[PDB]
Amino acid sequence: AFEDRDPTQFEERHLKFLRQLGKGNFGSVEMCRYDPLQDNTGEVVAVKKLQHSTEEHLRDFEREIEILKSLQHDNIVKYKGVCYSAGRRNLKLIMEFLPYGSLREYLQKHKERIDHIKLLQYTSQICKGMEYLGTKRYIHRDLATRNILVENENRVKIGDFGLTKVLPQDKEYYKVKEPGESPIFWYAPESLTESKFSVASDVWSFGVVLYELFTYIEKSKSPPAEFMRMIGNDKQGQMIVFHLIELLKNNGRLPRPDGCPDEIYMIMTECWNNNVNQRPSFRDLALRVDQIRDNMAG
Ligand SMILES: c1ccc(CN2CCC(n3cnc4cnc5[nH]ccc5c43)CC2)cc1
Numbered sequence: 001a002f003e004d005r006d007p008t009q010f011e012e013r014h015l016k017f018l019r020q021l022g023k024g025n026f027g028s029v030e031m032c033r034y035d036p037l038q039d040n041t042g043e044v045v046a047v048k049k050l051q052h053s054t055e056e057h058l059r060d061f062e063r064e065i066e067i068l069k070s071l072q073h074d075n076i077v078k079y080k081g082v083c084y085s086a087g088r089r090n091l092k093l094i095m096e097f098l099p100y101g102s103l104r105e106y107l108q109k110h111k112e113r114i115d116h117i118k119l120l121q122y123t124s125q126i127c128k129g130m131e132y133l134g135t136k137r138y139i140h141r142d143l144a145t146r147n148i149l150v151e152n153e154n155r156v157k158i159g160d161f162g163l164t165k166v167l168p169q170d171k172e173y174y175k176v177k178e179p180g181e182s183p184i185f186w187y188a189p190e191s192l193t194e195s196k197f198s199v200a201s202d203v204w205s206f207g208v209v210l211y212e213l214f215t216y217i218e219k220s221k222s223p224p225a226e227f228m229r230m231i232g233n234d235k236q237g238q239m240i241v242f243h244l245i246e247l248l249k250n251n252g253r254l255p256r257p258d259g260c261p262d263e264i265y266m267i268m269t270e271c272w273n274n275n276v277n278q279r280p281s282f283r284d285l286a287l288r289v290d291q292i293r294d295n296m297a298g
Pocket residue numbers: 021022023024025027028029046077095096097098099100101102146147148149159160162
């Protein structure tokens with residue numbers, strides 16, 4: 001006999017690998033087919049797992065599963081459950097599968113069909129998704145277009161939370177000392193220099209996402225491609241970070257993309273203020289971006 005009081009627990013035997021969606025360092029995301037009937041009646045899902053797990057990495061993963069479970073918003077990827085695989089001696093995270101993939105590969109593939117008002121719609125939704133996290137005191141710490149997913153032409157969702165921190169009620173930022181390479185060209189200056197993270201540091205990285213949208217993910221226009229151009233293309237290793245910090249702290253910034261409206265470029269530069277306290281909130285950005293759209297609606 002069988003009684004199911006928990007549909008969030010996926011059975012590993014009925015869960016079948018199809019192709020890799022994303023592969024990192026200590027993690028990986030797969031497209032899977034789940035068939036509790038095995039005649040193929042079950043959902044296509046997305047499954048995250050650990051690779052080169054530490055005991056420390058598993059404790060983080062359990063925390064990231066908690067985070068994602070705590071979130072219900074039209075612009076946050078849907079949690080579906082967990083699978084305790086390897087006969088209950090392993091943990092994996094099960095999520096909805098969004099057919100269009102990450103915003104990055106979508107905008108690179110369909111960059112002709114996607115006009116400015118459209119880029120503005122996805123920008124607004126990323127903002128709302130982030131204002132929702134801030135209501136929870138969550139710090140994302142990794143906004144870039146590869147971590148944003150496209151459910152269809154008119155909706156995107158924030159779709160990874162592997163670095164997400166939860167601020168205590170007492171504090172306004174999270175200092176996190178961590179080993180290994182960081183996405184330095186998306187990082188706020190205080191994040192580069194003091195490992196400090198906050199809603200304001202996510203605001204910074206948001207400005208870079210907006211830049212990425214307005215360059216239509218063109219490789220020669222990308223943040224590292226344009227920063228390396230300013231730092232010097234020949235720089236290697238620690239030297240780059242030294243120069244990137246010095247360039248940022250003296251107000252050097254990414255250029256306005258070809259064809260990007262000044263008012264949209266201006267939003268990027270407000271996001272990139274060295275003064276954490278002069279960065280707009282995500283509520284301010286969603287409101288500005290929606291009024292811009294509405295003034296381009298009629
Ligand atoms: C290791 C961990 C995370 C990452 C980020 N990386 C994971 C895969 C993710 N992704 C790409 N296409 C997707 C379609 N449906 C999905 N449902 C949930 C995620 C997802 C999709 C994009 C972000 C890369 C490497």
